[PDB]
Point group: C2
Chain length 118, copies 2
């Protein structure tokens, strides 16, 4: 759990554009988190897991293959939910005006590391 | 419908890594499409609308505001689902290695035009 949180530290602080992060089980249980005290870790975890289930089915049926990552771009912020091996998911809360390419690079690196640790 | 299909024609012809497009209602019904003969239009439209609804509920619950765009990346390809005003949704199937910068620029232009044409 410690090295996971340090992966999250790396990811989060490479730029102030990543608002927060959490590593969660595939079925919505938070493993570790780097989030504001006020944030709702449990709801973020459960919603991300549910979205991943739905998007997994849709990805496979939409000829896209196995789901790797899904971005939800809202008017106030972005949520990037990435598969980090078959046992974990990485949820990244991202500023609306963030540079998407940099963040996707950082998330790729963090995913590789997390999947390694699992 | 003709103007919307011309928007799709421009979008899809500007990029070879855009596999196909469709403009669908919020209820998942195809308004118009420029898709390969192999594609299942009704399935693509309905699943895009369903993804949109579920992720919208989630985003709003997590206080990220109204959902504007979804990018779903799979091992074999990507699908981009963009709100084009409150009445339409643009679905874009693109290659696994597509150039997302230019594609998202073109999609922004296309959704602006679609929303213009739908605000009647």
């Amino acid at each position: 759990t410690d090295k996971l949180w340090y992966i999250l530290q790396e990811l989060t602080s490479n730029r102030g554009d990543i608002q927060g992060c959490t590593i969660v089980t595939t079925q919505g249980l938070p493993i570790t988190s780097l989030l504001a005290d006020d944030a709702n870790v449990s709801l973020i975890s459960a919603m991300s897991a549910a979205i991943i289930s739905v998007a997994e089915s849709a990805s496979q049926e939409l000829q896209r293959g196995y789901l790797q990552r899904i971005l939800l771009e809202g008017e106030l912020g972005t949520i990037i939910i990435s598969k980090a091996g078959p046992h974990a998911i990485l949820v990244s809360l991202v500023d609306k005006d963030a540079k998407l390419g940099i963040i996707l690079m950082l998330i790729d690196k963090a995913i590789k590391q997390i999947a390694e640790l699992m």
